[PDB]
């Protein structure tokens, strides 16, 4: 069960709810109170999905879709076939994600480490709510949310974009994309570097921090240092959704025209019109 160094860290303590009644492991998995509530929601969710999937047409996992209701049903419940199952699943998902995040908190306490990971994981849970909850509330309909299916959800993204003519010109999107791209570059640069230091090969000597920082000063004239790149990484990645959320929320509630046209504020200033 145990790694060569694991046993010493496996003490009781650091729970949020329910003392040492759920303070134990199952193989490698810490089972918190949330460990339990996570599994509960996952079970329900995965059940609901299969039950809804059987009431639908195909079984090719690519072509399965659980869609939300027509727009007419507003912010109400809907029949289980015609969008309710989606509503159910949506809740089970939020159950599971929040449970997952809080379980990470419990683990973080038992090791005496920072809660930086559960924190960071709030970013994607947040964005999920922006798509599936907040924006739908603002347009008064659950039907504005996205269907659960492997390829089906891509067609929702597809049309949602083209509803605003050329979604590439959404300024919140431009930010979001820009962060996606730079974060991937950074990750290669980083992972690259750390390996480039430990693994120069030809049984040549293992290098130093000084070397790391020398490499980047040489190439691009600055080096941010070791701790800072992790802070920066977290920052970059987290802003993919933190900025993109503004972009998403804008579309519909605070903007109904083509996104390219929004750049009229600049183009059509009188001073150069």
């Amino acid at each position: 069960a145990l790694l060569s160094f694991e046993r010493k860290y496996r003490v009781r303590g650091g729970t949020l709810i329910g003392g040492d009644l759920f303070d134990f492991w199952v193989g490698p998995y810490f089972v918190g109170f949330f460990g339990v509530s996570a599994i509960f929601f996952i079970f329900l969710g995965v059940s609901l999905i299969g039950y809804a999937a059987s009431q639908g047409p195909t079984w090719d996992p690519f072509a399965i879709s659980i869609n939300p209701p027509d727009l007419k049903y507003g912010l109400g419940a809907a029949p289980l076939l015609e969008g309710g199952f989606w509503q159910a699943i949506t809740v089970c998902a939020l159950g599971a994600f929040i449970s997952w995040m809080l379980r990470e908190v419990e683990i973080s306490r038992k090791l005496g480490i920072g809660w930086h990971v559960p924190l960071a994981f709030c970013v994607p849970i947040f964005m999920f709510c922006v798509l599936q909850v907040f924006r739908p509330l603002l347009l008064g309909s659950w039907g504005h949310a996205f269907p659960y299916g492997i390829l089906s959800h891509l067609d929702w993204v597809n049309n949602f974009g083209y509803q605003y003519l050329n979604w590439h010109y959404n300024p919140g999107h431009m930010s979001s994309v820009s962060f996606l791209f730079v974060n991937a570059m950074a990750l290669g640069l980083h992972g690259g570097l750390i390996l480039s230091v430990a693994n120069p090969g030809d049984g040549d000597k293992v290098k130093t921090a000084e070397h790391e920082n020398q490499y980047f000063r040489d190439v691009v004239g600055y080096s941010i240092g070791a701790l800072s790149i992790h802070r920066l990484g977290l920052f970059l990645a987290s802003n993919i959704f933190l900025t993109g959320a503004f972009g998403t929320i804008a579309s519909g509630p605070f903007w109904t025209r083509g996104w390219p046209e929004w750049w009229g504020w600049w183009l059509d200033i009188p001073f150069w019109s």
């Binding site: 160094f5 480490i113 390829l151 690259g192 070791a226």
Partner: protein, 323 residues
């Protein structure tokens, strides 16, 4: 509340360490200068900067490309420089509009485009050499150099390989802010929705994975900042408690874990696979697939949804309809 994870509380100035290259220590230039606000989230020290043959070769070709692009961009606003600033985003240097095949197009129809691309390509080449040579000079793995090669190969794929394989310079990416963007939609439209290209999907997967991984890794190292987790090279060669706990967090969460080294392999690999996956898709596009949607349909992948409004036959194919 480890505040050191957020910003450096007490900064520390000190004398500038210089690690010695196998070559070109004389080609380092500029005076180091420290910087207090920058030093609150990062290293305060800016400069000096190595400045090799490769590095200078890059600045040369890079500028010749930029100048070509910009002179063309001026010409689009018949040189009135107020409209140049107003309209900047909308301006560009387009490849051929007309079909010349692989024929070298005239300058007034994307020859200037072709030109700028050559020089941009040479620029990326010499810059690659820098990123490689500097690693070899300081006695370091060439890992960064390879990731970057993938990136450069992807750029060649979209901007000249793919054009070559189908045989038209017309399928090149324009230079211009909005016009390099407008390419993406005209390209995807043409090849039957890029959402149905599996290589697009693979690319996006690794791209979103890079998000997931850095978010998580960064967060982790910060969580174990107090036990020295940021000193990664030593935690490799002599496992400390930082990375013991880091590993145990993840094992107890998701059932398996990495080592402090291997996570950087995972990251490096994921980064690299965005560009690889992308390249494959572009190479297959046009050459061995004309319509990614219908290809997905051919292989039974595509969804179908029922009609909301009445289904609508193509009026082109009705009896005695117009041209």
């Amino acid at each position: 509340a480890d505040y050191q994870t957020i910003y450096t509380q007490i900064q520390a100035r000190g004398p500038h360490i210089t690690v010695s290259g196998e070559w070109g220590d004389n080609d380092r230039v500029g005076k180091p200068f420290y910087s207090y606000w920058l030093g609150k989230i990062g290293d305060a020290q800016i400069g000096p900067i190595y400045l090799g043959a490769s590095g200078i070769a890059a600045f040369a070709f890079g500028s010749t490309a930029i100048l070509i692009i910009l002179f063309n961009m001026a010409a689009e606003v018949h040189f009135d420089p107020l409209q140049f600033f107003r309209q900047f985003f909308w301006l560009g240097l387009y490849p051929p509009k007309a079909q010349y095949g692989m024929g070298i197009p005239p300058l007034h129809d994307g020859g200037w485009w072709l030109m700028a691309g050559l020089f941009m390509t040479l620029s990326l080449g010499s810059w690659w050499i820098r990123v490689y040579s500097r690693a070899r000079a300081l006695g370091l793995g060439t890992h960064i150099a390879w990731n970057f090669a993938a990136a450069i190969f992807f750029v060649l794929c979209i901007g000249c390989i793919h054009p070559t394989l189908v045989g038209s310079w017309s399928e090149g990416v324009p230079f211009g802010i909005w016009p390099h963007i407008d390419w993406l939609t005209a390209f995807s439209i043409r090849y039957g929705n890029f959402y149905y290209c599996p290589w697009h999907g693979f690319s996006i997967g690794f791209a979103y994975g890079c998000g997931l991984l850095f978010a998580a890794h960064g967060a982790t190292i910060l969580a174990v900042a107090r036990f020295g987790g940021d000193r990664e090279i030593e935690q490799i060669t002599d496992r400390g408690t930082a990375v013991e706990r880091a590993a145990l967090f993840w094992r107890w969460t998701i059932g398996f874990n990495a080592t402090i080294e291997s996570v950087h392999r995972w990251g490096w690999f994921f980064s690299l696979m965005v560009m690889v996956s992308a390249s494959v898709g572009i190479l297959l596009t046009g050459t061995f697939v004309d319509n990614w949607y219908l290809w997905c349909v051919k292989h039974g992948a595509a969804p179908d949804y029922p009609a909301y409004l009445p289904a609508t036959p193509d009026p082109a194919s009705l009896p005695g309809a117009p041209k």
